[PDB]
Amino acid sequence: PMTDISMGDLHANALLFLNILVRQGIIAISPENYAKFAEIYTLPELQADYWGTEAPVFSAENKQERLEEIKKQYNALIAQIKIINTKKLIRLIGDELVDRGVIDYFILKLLQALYDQGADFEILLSNHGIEFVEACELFKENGNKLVAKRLGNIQHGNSFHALQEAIAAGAISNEEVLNIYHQVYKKHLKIISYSLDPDANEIKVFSHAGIGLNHIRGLARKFKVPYSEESAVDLAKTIDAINKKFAEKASSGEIHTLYTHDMMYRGYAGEHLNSTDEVVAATVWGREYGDLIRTSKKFKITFIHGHD
C-alpha cells in the first residue's frame, strides 16, 4: 500500500527489527508492550561485553530459571503483536541472525509471527545467516546439536552463541528452533531478489553484498538454469529460476553443499572468488567473480545491497 520495505543489516537487533515493523505499518503493538519489549531486549543480564565477555545470565547458577522467565514473557509479547499489513513486501538485506544482537531466539519468534499472520517478507542470503542454515542442516550430523565451528571462526555471532547457551541450559529447545528454521526461515530465503518495472524495462536487483550481472550469470551456471539478459523481464525470469533451484536445496537440507569452508575463509579475507564453484561464496561475500558487470545495453538496472 506504499513502497517496498527494504531493511538494512539488522545485526540481529530484534528491537530495531520491531521498530521498523511498527514505523512501516506492518505490525501493531501497544506502547506499553513495546516498552516491555525494549526492556527485555536491554536487560543487563542479557548484554555481552557488560561485566564479562559473556552476558551475566550464562554465568549465573540459576541461568535456566532466568532464561525461562525471559522467554515466557517474550513469547507473551509476541502473542500480542498483530500484523496489520499483509500486502507490503518486506525485504531483509540480511544479518538478521548470528550477529552482534542479544539472542537469535528474539528475531526467530518475530519471523514466525510474521509468517503465521500472513506478512510478505524475504530474506537475502548472507554470511551470517548461512551459519544458522548450516547449523540447522547439519543438526543430526553433529549429534543433535546446533554448531558451526568453522563458520564461527570468520564472524562474530553473539546472538547465535547466546542461542546455543540457552539451549544448553535447557531453557530453549532444539525442536522449536529447528521447526522455525524449516517451517519459516528457509522457505523465505533468496540468494538475490528484484523489483521489476516491465513497462520501463528497468529492474532493481537486491542482494546482501555488492554483485554484478557476472555473479547472476555464475549463479545460473551453478544451478544449471538458462541465463538470459535480453531485457529486464528476462533477467527477472533468470533470477526466479536461480531462486527456484535454491529453494530445492533449502528443501533437501543441502544449502551447505553450495560452498566449502575454504571459500568462506578466503571470502572473509577479502580475496577473489573467481572459480565457478565459488559463485555462491562470491555472492554472499560480495567478492570478485571475474570482471564486475553493472550495465547492460538491453535494460536499465540498479543494484541495492548492504555494506560489510
Numbering used by the authors: 24 to 331
Reproduce text from the manuscript describing this model.
IcmW-Interacting Protein B (WipB) is a 60 kDa Legionella effector of unknown function originally identified amongst a cohort of proteins that interact with the Dot/Icm T4S chaperone complex IcmS/IcmW10. Our data reveal that WipB is a modular effector, with an N-terminal Ser/Thr phosphatase domain related to the eukaryotic phospho-protein phosphatase (PPP) family, and a C-terminal domain sufficient to pilot WipB to the acidified LAMP1-positive lysosomal compartments in eukaryotic cells, where WipB interacts with the v-ATPase and the associated LAMTOR1 phosphoprotein, key components of the lysosomal nutrient sensing (LYNUS) apparatus. We propose that WipB is a lysosome-targeted phosphatase that modulates cellular nutrient sensing and the control of energy metabolism during Legionella infection.
The crystal structure of the N-terminal domain at 1.7 Å resolution comprising residues 25 to 344 revealed that WipB harbours a Ser/Thr phosphatase domain related to the eukaryotic phospho-protein phosphatase (PPP) family. The resulting fragment, WipB25-344, also yielded a stable protein, which in contrast to WipB1-364 crystallised readily. The structure was solved using the Molecular Replacement method, with the recently solved structure of WipA (a protein with 34% identity at amino acid sequence level) serving as a search model. WipB25-344 crystallizes as a dimer in the asymmetric unit. In chain A, density for residues 332–344 is missing while the same region is resolved in chain B, This region in chain B interacts with chain A, probably an artefact of crystal packing as WipB25-344 is monomeric in solution. The structure of WipB25-344 is very similar to that of WipA24-435 determined previously (the structures align with a root-mean-square deviation in Cα atoms of 1.9 Å over 279 WipB residues). In the PPP family, the DxH, GDxxDR, and NHE signature motifs are strictly conserved and comprise most of the residues that form the catalytic site14 WipB exhibits similar motifs, namely GDLHA, GDELVDR, and NHG, and these motifs cluster in one particular region of WipB25-244, on the loops connecting β1 and α1 (GDLHA), β2 and α4 (GDELVDR), and β3 and α5 (SNG). In WipB, Arg310 (equivalent of Arg369 in WipA), is conformationally restrained away from the active site and therefore cannot assume a role in substrate recognition.
